[PDB]
Amino acid sequence: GSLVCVGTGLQLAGQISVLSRSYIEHADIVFSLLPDGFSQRWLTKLNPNVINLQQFYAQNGEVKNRRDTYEQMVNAILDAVRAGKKTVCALYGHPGVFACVSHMAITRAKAEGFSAKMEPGISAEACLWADLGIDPGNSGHQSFEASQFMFFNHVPDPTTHLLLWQIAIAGEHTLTQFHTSSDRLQILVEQLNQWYPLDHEVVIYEAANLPIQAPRIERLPLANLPQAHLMPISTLLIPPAKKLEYNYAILAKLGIGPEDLG
C-alpha cells in the first residue's frame, strides 16, 4: 500500500495539476474533501471508487470536536493503505495548507513503513494574489489563523499584506461550532486596532469554486467587520497601514544611502 495526497485547487476541474489528475485516475481508491456536488461528480467520473471524508463531520446538530473528526478522517485513509491499496487523498486547494489531515496521514504512514508523499496544489492564497492583483513580495506577506492570532501573541508587520484565515470562526474555542459571533469579531477589531485604525479598509475575499462564478471582493472599514456576512470559506485581507521606510541602520552598515539604491 501507498499514499499520495493531492490538491484539486479551488476552481472546478481546471485548477488541478496535470500530474495530480493522473494520480487520481490511476488510484485504487480516493478519499475526497471537495467544495460542492459539482466537484464531487467530476471526481467520480475520473475515478468511481471514492470515499467522501465529509461524512466524518458532525451530523444532525451533533456536538463533535473537530479534533475527533480529523482523527477519524486520518484513520479511514490509513485503513486503505494498510489494506494494501494504492491510496490517493484529494483535498481542495493545497492539501497541506491550513489542513492537518494530509500531514497527519503522511506522518503516520511513514511511521508504519509505507510510502507517502504530498503533491502541492493551488491554495486560496494563490487565488487571492491573482484575483486582487497583489504580489506578496511587494511589501511582504503574513498569514495567521484568525483564532490563533486571538488566543496567542502574534505581532504583525503593518507594512505587509496580512491574511487572517478562517475568519468566520474567529474566537470559536470549543471547535464544535461552524461559525462565531459578532461579539467575538468586535474583540478582534479592538485587538487589531493596536496597529490599524478603525477606518482602515480591509477586504473580505472568497475565491470562486465554479467557472461561471465571480469571486467575492468586498471592501469595508475594519470597524464594520462584526456586522459583515462571513462564510466558512471567507478570508480576511488587511492591506498595509504604513508605507515602506528606509532602514538607515543597515544601509549604513552596507556603506550606502537611499540614493544609491537601483
Partner: protein
Amino acid sequence: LSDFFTQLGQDAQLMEDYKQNPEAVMRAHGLTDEQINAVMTGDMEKLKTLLVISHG
C-alpha cells in the same frame, strides 16, 4: 449543468467563448432560463437546487 461546468472549467477555448457571450454559450449548451438567471444574478445556492480542515 454539471457537464457544462466541467467542460467550461477545463477548456480554455470554451472559456474564452463564454466570456465573449455568456448567455449565447449557456443557451447553446441547453441551460434553462432559470439556470441562466441564477448565473447572471450570481445565486450559487439556486444552481445547487437545479470545508475547515484545521484549527488554531
